[PDB]
Paper text:
Flavin-binding fluorescent proteins (FbFPs), engineered from prokaryotic and eukaryotic light, oxygen, voltage (LOV) photoreceptors, are promising fluorescent reporter proteins. Their small size (about 10 kDa for monomeric FbFPs such as the improved LOV ([name]) protein derived from [name] phototropin photoreceptors) and their oxygen-independent fluorescence make them ideal reporters to monitor transport and anaerobic biological processes. In contrast to GFP-like fluorescent reporter proteins, whose absorption and fluorescence maxima can be tuned by exchanging certain chromophore-constituting amino acids, the absorption and fluorescence of FbFPs and other flavoproteins depends on noncovalently bound flavins, whose structure cannot be influenced by mutation. Using spectroscopy, X-ray crystallography, and quantum mechanics molecular mechanics calculations, we provide a firm structural and functional understanding of spectral tuning in FbFPs.
To elucidate the structural basis for the blue-shifted spectral properties, we determined the structure of [name]–[name]. Tetragonal crystals (space group P43212; one molecule per asymmetric unit) grew within 6 weeks and diffracted up to 1.45 Å resolution. Although in parental [name] the Iβ-strand is constituted by the residues 482 to 491, Iβ is shortened by two residues in [name]–[name] and ends at K489, followed by a kink in the subsequent residue, with the C terminus pointing away from the core compared with the parental [name]. In addition, the C-terminal end of Iβ becomes detached from the core (in the following described as unlatching), and the last three C-terminal residues lack detectable density. Interestingly, D491 and G492 have undergone post-translational modification to yield a cyclic imide structure (succinimide), which we speculate to be an artifact of protein aging. In parental [name], Q489 forms an H-bond with the FMN-O4 atom. In contrast, in the K489 mutant, the introduced K489 extends away from FMN and forms an H-bond with the O2 atom of the succinimide ring (K489-NZ…SNN-O2, 3.1 Å). Collectively, this results in opening up of the LOV core domain, which is expected to result in the influx of solvent molecules. In fact, additional electron density is present close to FMN-N5, which we interpret as an acetate ion, likely derived from the crystallization screen, which contained acetate buffer. Aside from those differences, the introduced lysine adopts a conformation that is facing away from the chromophore, which, in light of previous QM/MM calculations, accounts for the blue-shifted spectral properties of the variant, that is, due to the absence of a direct H-bonding interaction between the flavin and the introduced Lys.
Author numbering: 387 to 493
The structure:
Amino acid sequence: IEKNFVITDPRLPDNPIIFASDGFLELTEYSREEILGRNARFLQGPETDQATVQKIRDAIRDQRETTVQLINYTKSGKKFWNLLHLQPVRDQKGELQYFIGVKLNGS
Ligand SMILES: Cc1cc2nc3c(=O)[nH]c(=O)nc-3n(C[C@H](O)[C@H](O)[C@H](O)COP(=O)(O)O)c2cc1C
């Protein structure tokens, strides 16, 4: 499986992270207890381009796969480029269940 990914549940308030891979915890410097249950926007900060955040918001609204790149921050404030791939996960009836978010490659 992908080294660095999270899964969110959009059927819970504010689309919380319900799983974060070990590689995601290592890169972001947060513990599982600091990540589970919150929206992934906490990785954004002052240099994050709001035009890209808007593209993400639109892709989530329309429930479409997309790939964007935006500046994120580790727990200690280190900036990193996140080439973020978002994938909706649907059931057999076509109903949205989860989103997968993969950080593609990278530093
Ligand atoms: C599965 C998934 C993973 C996400 N991962 C990140 C991420 O790693 N970094 C980030 O800045 N935003 C990430 N987001 C985007 C935010 O959670 C949020 O959708 C975005 O900031 C736009 O919504 P808002 O305007 O309410 O903040 C992710 C979203 C989803 C659904």
